[PDB]
Design a protein around this ligand. Structure first.
Ligand SMILES: Nc1nc(O)c2nc(CNc3ccc(C(=O)O)cc3)cnc2n1
Ligand SMILES: Nc1nc(O)c2nc(CNc3ccc(C(=O)O)cc3)cnc2n1
Ligand SMILES: Nc1ncnc2c1ncn2[C@@H]1O[C@H](COP(=O)(O)O)[C@@H](O)[C@H]1O
Ligand SMILES: Nc1ncnc2c1ncn2[C@@H]1O[C@H](COP(=O)(O)O)[C@@H](O)[C@H]1O
Ligand SMILES: Nc1nc2c(c(=O)[nH]1)N=C(CO)CN2
Ligand SMILES: [Ca+2]
Ligand SMILES: [Ca+2]
Ligand SMILES: [Mg+2]
Ligand SMILES: [Mg+2]
Ligand SMILES: [Mg+2]
Lengths: 549, 549
């Protein structure tokens, strides 16, 4: 046993994990805590799915902050975290192609015997659930793991569950292994021996009976929509030996089956979630206003915070604060740094708020030093990185603490405010931008940023002719599966669509922006970045009322 | 030959190719059918139709030969003869040779199969009518018709039915001079060659789409002995079969027209801004400041200006000393001159006969906006026919007056009672020879409606998809209910109206009556441009290109 389960040599395996909770109000905190412990005790998170609200799947053939106290009382992993950015992952590529990995230390079964044994568990379980309420919140994760084998991983996983005391963590795959092991009898000091390999130990009694069998792939992989739903996000092309098709085909048949033989439409009550700060947002259910706070003429901290408060009351859900202009052909005031403009205002807002519904704060920056200071001093919620984190990808390290994750807007542009209007050739405008953003998400997701925390922005007016900016909006449907953030507010292209002189075109432009708000409303754009919050709020309130039947 | 004095029901077809002047043409045609044949008691819409396979008239009106009969301009509740025609009850025997049921079938089919050969060696502007006729026979009709055809100089008047009759015949001054009081000798020599035969019903009646389309407007439930079904059933089968067999949506090239002044307007193709000029908005009225605003509005983007001296806003006290026509007629008079010193249509918001008579006489207005759907003084309908020229009309639903309406709020079925009410109203004007294509529907937002009821009327605006639709939401209390002080509420209200503009835009509402023209115009311009899609295939074509790269 010590020769193989606890062998000296360090492996690099690929595991695919499923995460569940039943707590709606704390889902993010429960699941992101699980993610941290996974990242801490198992290896490196290299993929995540969206977060979903899922209808319970019991039959196949049809509130407290002790977590935060746990998070200051953890044993150290015997394995080191490396936060360095990676570009690729060999073992992961091998996993997906299904190619040649090490032999399993745990005895495998063939397809026939897997199918008989998986099948058996289901009928037993179906009739059990036949004889004898709340939504599930689900998430899948690919971990590049240093744990030797699936059984050892399940042990560590069980520890993670007891520590968190609400949470359910399943191993879906482990390399290309087919494993069915029926009557696991694990010794009280075997569990300790396993845990000690991976953790510097300072519960074990509970675990002994909790592992009765091991199935790889998990029994319910092909039988739960909610699982297939999550896997389709991460590994759509994957074909394990024990599966009839790729994950995408399996997901697709399941959608069309519920439609062609049950007339259900299964997507309707299995909602995709994104996360702006710490609450659940249902994808495509609200057009949130993001109020613009431009800090540069120098804008005084007190006046700027006044403007923030005004915006909250005008109905902004998110304030985007920026001290470095991206507007065409500008150059900043050299006398005063981005941080000097930005940080004081955010410090003053935090003081002025704490004296007293709290707006989410986004910082429009591409600069590591500025974002580091903001995050250290709990001043911000979201990075609005207009370079899609390409200017300094080290900024991605700042999006993860331990317990906490930060959300991020990824925007498309080329060049800078002086060059961008010239950088306007695209072979396939709509899809070049779309593919660029997906590629940027992939890189973030490979580097452990949760998928459901990443927002897409097409960068209107940035290296786009006015007709091109229009075409991007005409084809906004292309982002129907994704959290979407856009900024049209007061841009030159609005004016290009139109027919005291100086103050007149100013007005037509704000008024034209409200047409794009209306359009965004009907296209179900998740976030809109605007200067004129009150006007935008008035439009959206009325459009919302016309929809309440 | 030409003896007795009787009354018959006569369905006509009216055609033209002159798109630019189809109104001036067909309404001269209509009036000559009013002078020389009897009384117009039904019309269909104007239609631009595909033929299925792919300045002198002003003086002609001063010099017309008068009918032997008198023009009865007075209103009617119903027509007994027309009601008999519709059920095919007992009418007189024909003063012409009527053929049997199975012989007409064979005699018509040869004229069809002969005629798709002589043709086999532009746009159609169609309009049907129903006439209470003093003429005793189809042929004497066709005689005065071809006289009318020739008397113009581009016009094809046909007879589609004549009571219950089934006629075929193979092959004048005495007819003309006993119906009408006599270079007039170019006519009779043309006519003798021009008239060749007579078929009742008309030959193409059951084959041409352009006719079933027109007949569906006027007489849906009408069933001839000849035709194997009701007009509605034939029409709906023609639509259903062009879809099932040929895969054509047959409506798309056969467009319903409404008319605001003298030009063509394609139903549902444009949301027109109607600028509000309410003269009664301290103690002195400024007739020059109001023409200022008319011009300001034209420049701001108004197609139409609605002027009213009488206010119908809630609980309004009408100016006790100065009258409606002194508020309105000189403000209009000033306008007419300074314009003569791209001409906007002028709508007068009045229920008052004398005011409209005075505006119509002095060429000051094109449209009657009647907020009582002409129930205050049904006689006002008579002023919509200066027998040469016609005028269009907005018919609006309300109950009570500005002090009682807020209470008058119980409907049996809100949406449909109002639709039925306006339809009945249209039927009245039509039965009295107001051309169908000149009657606009208004649901009267805020007029005897609770705020939720104004919203419910909008939610269900699709119910008017067949009809020209004029609405007025601008600045009404219901907008506000949906959402250094008191300044906000004014702004919020205007900004929330722009939502309704946008909704109106997408719901294809034909006219919107607004205060804030510029703001509205800006929203409509941007929405229009977003819908201006260069290639309708490109979104799937670009998507495929991307998936292949
Ligand atoms: N995520 C995000 N998304 C934007 O759209 C954005 N825009 C600006 C402002 N930048 C511009 C760019 C172009 C133009 C013009 O052509 O007028 C104007 C302003 C700043 N931060 C931004 N952040
Ligand atoms: N065709 C037409 N269609 C209208 O909608 C309209 N409205 C007014 C203005 N009347 C009102 C009624 C209600 C309200 C409120 O609730 O605020 C305000 C103004 C005047 N002429 C009108 N003419
Ligand atoms: N691949 C697997 N992942 C997680 N649990 C498993 C797996 N195979 C078997 N099990 C067992 O299934 C139970 C997990 O709890 P539940 O999710 O309620 O079934 C435990 O007894 C596990 O040992
Ligand atoms: N029901 C009918 N109405 C009008 N003209 C008819 C009818 N039946 C036969 N005709 C004749 O057929 C010709 C048809 O003309 P058109 O339809 O303009 O090609 C006319 O010149 C008439 O003399
Ligand atoms: N949708 C959904 N249904 C379930 C889940 C789950 O995670 N999601 N877990 C279960 C027992 O582990 C039983 N049923
Ligand atoms: Ca790690
Ligand atoms: Ca008459
Ligand atoms: Mg579960
Ligand atoms: Mg489980
Ligand atoms: Mg003809």
């Amino acid at each position: 046993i010590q020769e193989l389960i606890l062998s000296e040599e360090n492996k690099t395996n690929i595991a695919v994990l499923n995460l569940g909770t039943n707590d709606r109000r704390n889902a993010v905190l429960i699941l992101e805590t699980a993610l941290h412990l996974v990242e801490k005790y198992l290896g490196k998170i290299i993929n995540t799915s969206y977060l979903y609200e899922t209808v319970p799947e019991y039959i196949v053939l049809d509130d407290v902050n002790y977590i935060n106290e746990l998070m200051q009382n953890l044993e150290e992993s015997k394995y080191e975290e490396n936060k360095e950015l990676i570009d690729k992952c060999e073992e992961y590529e091998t996993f997906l192609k299904n190619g040649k990995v090490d032999n399993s230390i745990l005895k495998e079964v063939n397809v026939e015997n897997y199918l008989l044994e998986c099948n058996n568990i289901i009928v037993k379980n179906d009739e059990i659930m036949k004889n004898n309420t709340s939504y599930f919140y689900n998430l899948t994760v690919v971990v590049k793991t240093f744990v030797n084998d699936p059984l050892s991983m399940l042990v560590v996983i069980k520890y993670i569950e007891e520590l968190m005391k609400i949470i359910d963590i399943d191993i879906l795959f482990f390399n290309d292994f087919t494993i069915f092991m029926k009557n696991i009898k694990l010794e009280k000091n075997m569990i300790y021996k396993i845990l000690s390999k991976y953790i510097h130990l300072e519960i074990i009694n509970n675990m002994v009976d909790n592992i009765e069998f091991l199935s790889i792939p998990h029994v319910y992989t092909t039988h739960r929509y909610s699982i297939l739903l999550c896997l389709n996000d991460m590994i759509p092309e994957y074909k394990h030996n024990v599966l009839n098709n790729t994950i995408r085909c399996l997901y697709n048949k399941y959608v069309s089956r519920m439609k062609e033989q049950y007339n259900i439409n299964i997507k309707e009550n299995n909602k995709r979630i994104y996360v702006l700060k710490d609450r659940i947002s249902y994808l495509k259910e609200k057009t949130n206003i993001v109020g613009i706070l431009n800090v540069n003429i120098f804008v005084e901290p007190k006046r700027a915070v006044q403007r923030m408060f005004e915006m909250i009351n005008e109905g902004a859900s998110v304030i985007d604060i920026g001290g470095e202009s991206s507007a065409p052909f500008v150059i900043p005031n050299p006398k005063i740094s981005e941080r000097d403009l930005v940080v004081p205002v955010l410090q003053l807002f935090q003081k002025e708020w704490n004296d007293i519904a709290k707006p989410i704060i986004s910082i429009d920056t591409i600069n590591y030093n500025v974002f580091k200071e903001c995050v250290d001093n709990d001043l911000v919620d979201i990075l609005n990185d207009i370079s899609a984190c390409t200017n300094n990808p080290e900024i991605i390290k700042l999006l993860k603490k331990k317990n906490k994750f930060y959300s991020v807007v990824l925007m498309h542009k080329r060049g800078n405010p002086h060059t961008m209007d010239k950088l306007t050739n695209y072979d396939n405008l709509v899809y070049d931008i779309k593919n660029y953003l997906e590629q940027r998400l992939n890189f973030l997701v490979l580097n452990g940023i949760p998928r459901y925390r990443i927002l897409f922005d097409i960068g209107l007016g940035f290296a786009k002719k006015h007709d091109q900016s229009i075409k991007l909006l005409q084809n906004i449907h292309v982002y129907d599966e994704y959290p979407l953030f856009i900024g049209y507010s007061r841009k030159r292209f609005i004016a290009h669509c139109m027919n005291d002189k100086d103050q007149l075109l100013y007005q037509k432009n704000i008024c034209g922006g409200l047409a794009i708000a209306s359009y965004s409303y009907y296209k179900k754009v998740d976030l809109i970045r605007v200067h004129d919050v009150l006007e935008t709020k008035s439009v959206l309130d009325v459009l919302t009322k016309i929809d309440q039947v």
